Design a protein around this nucleic acid. Structure first.
Ligand code: AMP
Ligand code: GLU
Length: 529
RNA sequence: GGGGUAUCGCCAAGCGGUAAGGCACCGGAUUCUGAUUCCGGCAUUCCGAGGUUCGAAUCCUCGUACCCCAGCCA
C-alpha cells in the first residue's frame, strides 16, 4: 500500500468512484528509462489490482521535439515490462479539434485573449518570484477581436512568436503558473501524427486536464514538479463545459546512484556518441537494461521494493543489483567460461580427453545435467594461480592442490614464464581418480568468446549535479575481454542468461554476436566479499 | 513570494498507547561456485526547542534544513 492507494480506497468507500481509471502519458521525445518503469508499475498495477482500466497516451503537443521512432519504442517497452493498456493507444493529438473548440469557449467566455507581446516581453511582464506581474496592453480586446485574431493564428496568418493565446487569470498571483498562462503557440512544424494540418499547438497545461477528462481518468498520477500546476489543471476544467473532473496526485520521482535519469542528458550521451545508443547496456533505459540482461520481472520487483511516496530519494545501485541477482540465482543455468585464460597442462594425463557430468544448477537437480569435455590441456583464469601467498588464499598454489570444478584434483609443480617475466603455462599432475575449487575450460573443445564486462557509467554518485557531467564518465564502464567457454554455449540465444560459475551472470547478443564470434554481456557479478 | 518534504548508511511502515520490513553492514553454521542457504546482531529513538496528555514519531507553538516554480518545454 502507499498514500495513493489509500486515497483510492477512501474514494471507493465513500462512493465518489466505483471504478478506477488511470493512465501512463509519456511524451514521445526519447526512450523510456527505469524512472518511467516506476510510473508504469504504479499506474498499470493499480488498474489491475482494483479491477480497472489504464490507458497509454502519448502527450504529443510539441512537434519539434518528437519523433515516430519514439512512439514505437515506448509501446515496445511497456509491453516487454508485462503490461496491457485499455483500448487503442491514445494521443493528445486525437483531441486537437476538441482542444481548439474549448479554447473558443474560453474566448467567448472572456477568459482567454490573443496577445502580441514578443517572447521576450512576456517574460518581462511576468513579474518574479517575489514581485508581481503586470497586464499586457492587449489583455482587454473584445471577444470579437480575439476570435478573429485566433483564427488568423490558426490559418497561419502570424509568424512564429508574433502572437499567442493566453488565459486571462491573475497577473499578481503568488502561483506563477496562473499569471495568464499561454494556451497556444505558433509552430510551422510537421507533426508525426497530424502532418501539416495544424500550425498552432496546445500547451501541456491546457491539454493534459482536458485529455484526462475526455478519457474518463479518475486519478491522474504525476511527479512532484507538477504540484503548482494542479491549480491550472483545476482552473481549466472548472471553466469549460465538461462533465467530469479528474483529481491529480503527485509522487516523488526515482533517482539512481551513479547515473543520470533525464531525457535531455541521456539524449546527450546518445547524440555525442559516448554510448552506442539508447539501448547501450550501460544505459538506464528499459531497452539498455533489457540488452544488459535484466528480466522484466526483476524490474517490477525493484519498483515494488522502492515504494511510492513524496520524499525525494536516491536509490543505491546495490538495491537494483539485488533484484536481478535474486531472479537469476534461482533461474539461471550454470556453465563454464574463462575471461582471462592461461594454459595449464596435466603432464600426468593420457589420452585425447574424456567427458564429465555437470549439473545445470548446483542446488536444483530438477533442472538436469550435461556432459562436458575434460582433458590434459585446459584453460584456467590467471587470478586462480598463485606461486605464493597467504593462508586464506584457497586457490591453486605452486605447491598445493585444488579441485577442478566437477572434475579432478590437480597439483601445481612447475611453471614457465616469458621475456617480460609473464607466465605462459602451468604444469600440473592430476589424481587418476578424485571425483578450494576453480572453474576451467578444455583448450581442445573450447569456444572462442568475447566477454564484455560492464561497470557504473559515471565516476561519481550524483553525476547530474556536476558542472559538466560528461567529464565525470567512467573510462572503465566497458572493458572487453577475449576468453574461452565450454562448447555447450554454442547454442546460446539472445534472451537467455547463464551463470558463469564463480564470475557472474552473462547473456548473449550485445547487438554484436555472430555465429563465428559470440559476444557475451556481464549482467551483474556475484556477491564478492 | 508560493508550493512541498523532514523516522537506521540507502529506501520505507507508523494516522495518541508506548519504533514493521527491504537493500547494506557485523558474527556463526552448511556448501565441489570464497555464490547460494542458513541462525544471530544492528534506531530507549523518530530535524530542533517548548507545549497538551496518564501516555505522542503520531496534536499545538516557534524554529531549522533541503526540494520545486519567473519555457510561446513536459
Ligand atoms: N524519474 C522518474 N520517476 C518516476 N516517474 C517518472 C520519472 N521520469 C519520468 N517519469 C514519468 O513518466 C511519465 C511521463 O514521461 P515524461 O513525459 O517523458 O516525463 C510521468 O507520468 C511520470 O510518471
Ligand atoms: N506529461 C507529464 C504527465 C504527468 C501528469 O501530468 O500526470 C509528465 O511528463 O510527467
Amino acid at each position: 500500500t502507499n498514500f495513493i492507494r489509500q486515497i483510492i480506497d477512501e474514494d471507493l468507500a465513500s462512493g465518489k468512484h466505483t471504478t478506477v481509471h488511470t493512465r501512463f502519458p509519456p511524451e514521445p521525445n526519447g526512450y523510456l528509462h527505469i524512472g518511467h518503469a516506476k510510473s508504469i508499475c504504479l499506474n498499470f498495477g493499480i488498474a489491475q489490482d482494483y479491477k480497472g482500466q489504464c490507458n497509454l497516451r502519448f502527450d504529443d503537443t510539441n512537434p519539434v521535439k518528437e519523433d515516430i521512432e519514439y512512439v514505437e519504442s515506448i509501446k515496445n517497452d511497456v509491453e516487454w515490462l508485462g503490461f496491457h493498456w485499455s483500448g487503442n493507444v491514445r494521443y493528445s493529438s486525437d483531441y486537437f479539434d476538441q482542444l481548439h473548440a474549448y479554447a473558443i469557449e474560453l474566448i467567448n467566455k472572456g477568459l482567454a485573449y490573443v496577445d502580441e507581446l514578443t517572447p521576450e516581453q512576456i517574460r518581462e511582464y511576468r513579474g518574479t518570484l517575489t514581485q508581481p506581474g503586470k497586464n499586457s496592453p492587449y489583455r482587454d480586446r473584445s471577444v470579437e477581436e480575439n476570435l478573429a485574431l485566433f483564427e488568423k493564428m490558426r490559418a497561419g496568418g502570424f509568424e512564429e512568436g508574433k502572437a499567442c493565446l493566453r488565459a486571462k487569470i491573475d497577473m499578481a498571483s503568488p502561483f506563477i503558473v496562473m499569471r495568464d498562462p499561454v494556451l497556444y503557440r505558433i509552430k510551422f512544424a510537421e507533426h508525426h501524427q497530424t502532418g501539416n494540418k495544424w500550425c498552432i499547438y496546445p500547451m501541456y497545461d491546457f491539454t493534459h486536464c482536458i485529455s484526462d477528462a475526455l478519457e474518463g481518468i479518475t486519478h491522474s498520477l504525476c511527479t512532484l514538479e507538477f504540484q503548482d500546476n494542479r491549480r491550472l489543471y483545476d482552473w481549466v476544467l472548472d471553466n469549460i463545459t465538461i462533465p467530469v473532473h479528474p483529481r491529480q496526485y503527485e509522487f516523488s520521482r526515482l533517482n539512481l546512484e551513479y547515473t543520470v535519469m533525464s531525457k535531455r542528458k541521456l539524449n546527450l550521451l546518445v547524440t555525442d556518441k559516448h554510448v552506442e545508443g539508447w539501448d547501450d547496456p550501460r544505459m538506464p533505459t528499459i531497452s539498455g537494461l533489457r540488452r544488459r540482461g535484466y528480466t522484466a520481472a526483476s524490474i517490477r520487483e525493484f519498483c515494488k521494493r522502492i515504494g511510492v511516496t513524496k520524499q525525494d530519494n536516491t536509490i543505491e545501485m546495490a538495491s537494483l543489483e539485488s533484484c536481478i541477482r535474486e531472479d537469476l540465482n534461482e533461474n539461471a543455468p550454470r556453465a563454464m567460461a574463462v575471461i582471462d585464460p592461461v594454459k595449464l597442462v596435466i603432464e600426468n594425463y593420457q589420452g585425447e580427453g574424456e567427458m564429465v557430468t555437470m549439473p545445470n544448477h548446483p542446488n536444483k537437480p530438477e533442472m538436469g545435467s550435461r556432459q562436458v569435455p575434460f582433458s590434459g590441456e585446459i584453460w584456467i583464469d590467471r587470478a586462480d594461480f598463485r606461486e605464493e601467498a597467504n593462508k586464506q588464499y584457497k586457490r591453486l598454489v605452486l605447491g598445493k592442490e585444488v579441485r577442478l570444478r566437477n572434475a579432478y584434483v590437480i597439483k601445481a609443480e612447475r611453471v614457465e614464464k616469458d621475456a617480460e617475466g609473464n607466465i605462459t603455462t602451468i604444469f600440473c599432475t592430476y589424481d587418476a581418480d578424485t571425483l578450494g575449487v576453480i572453474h576451467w575450460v578444455s583448450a581442445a573443445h573450447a569456444l572462442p568468446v568475447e566477454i564484455r564486462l560492464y561497470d557504473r557509467l559515471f565516476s561519481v554518485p550524483n553525476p547530474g549535479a556536476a558542472d559538466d557531467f560528461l567529464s565525470v564518465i567512467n573510462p572503465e564502464s566497458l572493458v572487453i575481454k577475449q576468453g574461452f567457454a565450454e562448447p555447450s554455449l554454442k547454442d546460446a540465444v539472445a534472451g537467455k542468461a547463464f551463470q558463469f560459475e564463480r564470475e557472474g551472470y552473462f547473456c548473449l547478443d550485445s547487438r554484436h554476436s555472430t555465429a563465428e564470434k559470440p559476444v557475451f554481456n556481464r549482467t551483474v557479478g556475484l556477491r564478492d566479499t
